[PDB]
Amino acid sequence: SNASDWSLSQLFASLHEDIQLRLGTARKAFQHPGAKGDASEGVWIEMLDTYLPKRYQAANAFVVDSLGNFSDQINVVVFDRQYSPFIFKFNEQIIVPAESVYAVFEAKQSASADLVAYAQRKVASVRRLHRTSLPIPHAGGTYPAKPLIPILGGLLTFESDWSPALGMSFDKALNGDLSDGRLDMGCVASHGHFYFNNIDSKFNFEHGNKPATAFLFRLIAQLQFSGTVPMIDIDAYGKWLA
Amino acid sequence: ASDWSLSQLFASLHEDIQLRLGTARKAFQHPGAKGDASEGVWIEMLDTYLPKRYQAANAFVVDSLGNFSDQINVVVFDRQYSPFIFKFNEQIIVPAESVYAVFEAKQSASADLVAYAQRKVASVRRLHRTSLPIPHAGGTYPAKPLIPILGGLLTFESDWSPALGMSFDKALNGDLSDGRLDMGCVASHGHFYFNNIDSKFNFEHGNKPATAFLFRLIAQLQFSGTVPMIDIDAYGKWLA
Amino acid sequence: SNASDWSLSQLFASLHEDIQLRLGTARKAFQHPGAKGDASEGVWIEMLDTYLPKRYQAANAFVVDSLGNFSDQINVVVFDRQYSPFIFKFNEQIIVPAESVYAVFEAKQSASADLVAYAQRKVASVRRLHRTSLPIPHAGGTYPAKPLIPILGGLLTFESDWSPALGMSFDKALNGDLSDGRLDMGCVASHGHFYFNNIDSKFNFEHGNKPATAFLFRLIAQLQFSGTVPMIDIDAYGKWLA
Amino acid sequence: ASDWSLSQLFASLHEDIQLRLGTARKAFQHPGAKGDASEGVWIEMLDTYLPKRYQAANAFVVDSLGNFSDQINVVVFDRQYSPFIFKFNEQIIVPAESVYAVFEAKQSASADLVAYAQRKVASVRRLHRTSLPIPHAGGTYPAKPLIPILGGLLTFESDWSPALGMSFDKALNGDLSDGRLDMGCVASHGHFYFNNIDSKFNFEHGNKPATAFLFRLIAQLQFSGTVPMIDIDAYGKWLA
Amino acid sequence: ASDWSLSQLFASLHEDIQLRLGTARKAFQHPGAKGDASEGVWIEMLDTYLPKRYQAANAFVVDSLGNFSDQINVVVFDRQYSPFIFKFNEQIIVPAESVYAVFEAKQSASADLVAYAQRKVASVRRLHRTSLPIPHAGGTYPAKPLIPILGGLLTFESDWSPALGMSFDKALNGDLSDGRLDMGCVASHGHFYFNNIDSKFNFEHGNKPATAFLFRLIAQLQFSGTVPMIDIDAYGKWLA
Amino acid sequence: SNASDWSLSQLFASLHEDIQLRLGTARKAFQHPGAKGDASEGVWIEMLDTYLPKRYQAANAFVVDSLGNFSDQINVVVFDRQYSPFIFKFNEQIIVPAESVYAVFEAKQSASADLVAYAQRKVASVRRLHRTSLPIPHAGGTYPAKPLIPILGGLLTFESDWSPALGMSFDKALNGDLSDGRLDMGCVASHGHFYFNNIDSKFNFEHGNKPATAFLFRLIAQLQFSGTVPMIDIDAYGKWLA
Ligand SMILES: [Cl-]
């Protein structure tokens, strides 16, 4: 028909449905584990690349610090490039300094105790890295060295192996690591999303209501508190030139 | 999903099209934006999957006698051997000689829309096409006899119930000469094509409609080979 | 000859002449109203995309707010993406939040009383939208919520239907809407440009002297006063997830 | 401007070229930058409008015997069947076998510049081109006889008054063997071409000079068909 | 470096490949990332220098009977006349009919890796390829007889000492039927190819190994001409 | 083998070796002086484009100021576009305002007294230009006009004509211009890098230890002190519209 009545709710439905279908497709179409993971990870990266403010980059990467320690391979890194160099780039493959990182996520097909623990380990391999911070020159003078921002960590999946999907067994698994490996938020595209409440010191699960869109908004809102990354001391990395 | 499946690949190709056409229709509550969204989905399918000898875009078509077509939502045309007549950023005018196929893309099939599509197809087929002898590695071919331009209609839905039944068949039989549609797709229901042997339209229900249409188009395009060789000096008569 | 004497004035002449010719071409070559408008609008967008500082995006878009209200289709939106998400993106089509908007313009072929009023209505459909504003975390602490910036509005044309082109009838039309629909500035590529003087509370017309370049500089200078958009409350949009 | 017009489309195509070449000349008051600006306008015209079987770029040309050309402002060449000999970011060296046409692009025609262009064209035509039997769907063609390489000059203005008169004609008749120019364009005035039937140069005044030249080039290129099939192992003799 | 040199251009082409493959191996201390880095170097060489009639990418291959290959590091295939079977962002599945050549790219040659490559090549050659009569400007060709699919191995180093000696020769003679390798490159040492006349493998030492391999590949590909014309309706049997 | 032990030192080695080889290739392969220079200059530009924070642009350009004066052609300009327009852009050719410039470099094949003096002249042609600076609106109010930042100047080469490469004759040449033409830093890819020490008011040479990487880090660290360019007064350029 010729009726036209704009709906904001429909936009958020369509945003989520696109993610859910493409993740379902990646799982069903690719019967090779490498291709299936690459396909799914790309769906999440495209969502962040499309919708996050441009102050954020989103890509697969290794993280490195000025002590010469490296993270594991991170499926989805959210990081700064406005104020931060790459440490190494070779064609499309990138290694980013720890000081550039805002958030790190593991992306897999279905939530489980083993996957949650694996994600907790990936996140810990980033949070253990050392980050420098120098006083920051700006138009109004020089700020003190910014105190180190929290790196957000999380888990992104299509499905859940538990029944109910987002129940006590998921909660138990999340409480397995409340320090270096703590997962601040995550999304189960077929069911809902979760986040850690700092005030109550507990995990909250939110069911349905456009899970991928709700996760995206939660990520944007939480990132706002981080402001910009602290200012990197590239000469700390330069000790390794000799 | 135990193992690789061609059926699954073709289902996923179609489901992507069906869902994005539905998103275009639901999300964009403005007639211009809704049309642009839906047309872009169909163009993207053609751009991704057609052999690279084919271009797919929105364009006007014009001939060397100064006859212009209406704006065509989805033109399939040659660029390997054919110039543009005019390009201004994203707006293109292509010579009639370059055209392989023309489609109208809309939300839902109806008697008015089938007729509209037939008229659009006829407007392109009525344009004059030059054809020169063709130099090639082995010598010079005689001028290629003119290829038929394929025509069709692409929609998300059908206004009829049943969607792809006798009323649709009646509309398609409304133009059996230079507006005749060769094929088309209703993403939510099936596809149709003209069967030249039986001189009748056939409908195929379900069975991955967008992918079925894509394959029908590729197979039929093969018979056209490459476009005839344009006489650009026929257009050059308008320089003076 | 082999003479070389750089001229800054010539650069600004060439910048304007390019715009004037391409707008004239769009009008003459495309005898289909949709194609003609798309061609012309693209000329103005390319000028802004080429020359504006990269903190500004310029594109055709719909604007939406956290109350679920939508603007009309805006030919030329100038908006933030460094700090602002898209609300929806589908291939090249975008819907931006009201909080991201710096300026909105209507682009048409020739200035007239009807076109000025139409542009005033387009601008009003944006200014009526609600914009959130949160306290802003930064390297030096937290700023108060930034007071809402003015959205600049305007009209971009190739020609004028009036004789003289930029005379009292144009002035009358501009004074038709001095609130939600007020046009702050605009350009008539073949004749000159206009702007509203806040101190004198009157419209000023400037004839010739590279109209498109003069408009571009006026826009850059006025945008500088706006600083960056206020910080969006994406959770205000998230009320529509349920 | 009541209705669509091919004449208007061709006028707008030309006016865009003429104005941007004038901008390049006026705005960039540095000889390197001015040349780069003007050359890029001509390359953009060719890139936009030539059939995609043609590439257009600045390049050096080299043959399998180690003979190198000078740097050529505008080379029209094949990539569908031809490798690069060397590419380093934006700098390319193409095999002689890939070349369809070579142009010098400068600000204003003059006796010195016509001669310069003739010399550049001869330097490419003097390079050796291999040609092997060509496998194709129907079998194997004999080696294609070598295609003539087209040569020309592209400018914004003319130093002469009249712009395209007897002095220009005298300069063009200065090289009637391997430096002979086939065609060229003076954007502000007209275009020229060698008429093989009359064995004389012809000038066409006004009537959308850049577009007229574009069409002349497309029509003449058609006679060349595709480049001969390169013997890359002739170049491979230099591996040892 | 007094003057232009084809030998130098070919040395620089090779040195770029050799150094970047060594960088991939040294710098990326993770097996997935190391492989991705090295594979991308070889793909970039092919993308830059092969004629544009060839695509080069990582892909799965599938046929119209539902037989799927393993993931192939470097597939050389047609897109001018061939659709994708499936594309999802960067992941592609190509029809067997589109394939010209298949390579495995790894760090260092070894008996296990030569065997692995032979198996990968056989898996693609065992897939069924359709071939239809081909419409063209002059009429219709008979269906093109199936082209041989070229196979090979690309590495940076060799595990053997000598690098390209009898042990390598023994490994290559391990598969002389549908897994037989046609050619390959060891960037640090040389290249190899199967000599059909002598029915033996030949090794070429030094003399710009990557460039020598590139030229060998281009020359051999020429004999294949273009892929046969796919019957997409054979794939369409899986729509139901 | 299957061993995996990440090394930060190796990344910096590979970064430098890539530059050294590609510069060596440009010199050896292209026996035409224009092509050879274009090839080499492109190597340095790609390094800066790849690794510098995205607040910096790196390209070949002419610089112009609001008095209508122009620099010479600058091989490698590092400049702002986040807050700065182009003055003119024609296809890929750009003219940038002086207010946008952070650093300027000359790139040539081999260091020599003549090349150092030529580079000093290029740098001086930029530093002599006039730069405006306006009070800066931001989320916290209005900063005073930022005091003009130093423009960094330098020389980038593959080789040195002197033996030793980085010896007293290089030092003498560098001390030829300690004002408008002073070279703050530079790189000789085959040998080392140099920088001016402000405290000691002398030039320092550092040999080997990944020269291009050491130069890159020195540039990043020094640029940090400059903060963002001052805010341009585009209306100063607008005086040339009439
Ligand atoms: Cl009609």
Ligand SMILES: [Cl-]
């Ligand atoms: Cl010569």
Ligand SMILES: [Cl-]
């Ligand atoms: Cl097998």
